[PDB]
Amino acid sequence: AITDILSAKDIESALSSCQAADSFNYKSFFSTVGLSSKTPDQIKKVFGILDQDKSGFIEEEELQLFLKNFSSSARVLTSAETKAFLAAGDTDGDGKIGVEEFQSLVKA
Ligand SMILES: [Ca+2]
Ligand SMILES: [Ca+2]
């Protein structure tokens, strides 16, 4: 579970911050839930959850459902938010986010 590594309380605070459409920013969310200080294994576990269909990569539609991993009532990210998110993380430009890229994003 995601709460195996992250505090439900931190998650609540991160979600309340980005309730408005187009308010989302991965750097703010990542710090509020406390991803920045996690180890490779912990980051890999979080990645595995975000990779909802277990394909090994986080594709665009999964970035769309980014908040849904933290709360089933959370909103879907907008196309703009998703586009910017993917733009930030997709280093090699294959259109998706792999574990190495996710790690880099967390430790940036
Ligand atoms: Ca996937
Ligand atoms: Ca990529």
Swiss-Prot record:
The keyword Metal-binding belongs to this UniProt entry's keyword annotation = yes
Q: Which UniProt keywords apply?
A: Acetylation, Calcium, Metal-binding, Repeat
Cross-referenced CDD domains: EFh_parvalbumin_beta (cd16255)
Q: Name one GO molecular function term.
A: calcium ion binding
**UniProt cross-references to Pfam families, sorted A to Z:** EF-hand_7 (PF13499)
Question: Domain EF-hand, which positions?
Answer: 38-73, 77-108
Question: Is Transmembrane helix a UniProt keyword of this protein?
Answer: no
Where does the chain bind Ca(2+) 2? Answer: D90, D92, D94, K96, E101
Gene3D superfamilies from the UniProt entry: EF-hand
Q: Which residues bind Ca(2+) 1?
A: D51, D53, S55, E62
Xref: SUPFAM superfamilies: EF-hand
- Give the residues annotated as coiled coil: none
Top-level division of the source organism's lineage? Eukaryota
Chain positions with N-acetylalanine modification: A1
State any further remark: This parvalbumin has an isoelectric point of 4.3.
Q: What does this protein do?
A: Appears to promote immune maturation in bone marrow cells in culture. Binds two calcium ions.
* Family recorded in the similarity comment: Belongs to the parvalbumin family.
PANTHER family per UniProt: PARVALBUMIN ALPHA, PARVALBUMIN, THYMIC
Task: Supply the name of the protein.
Answer: Parvalbumin, thymic
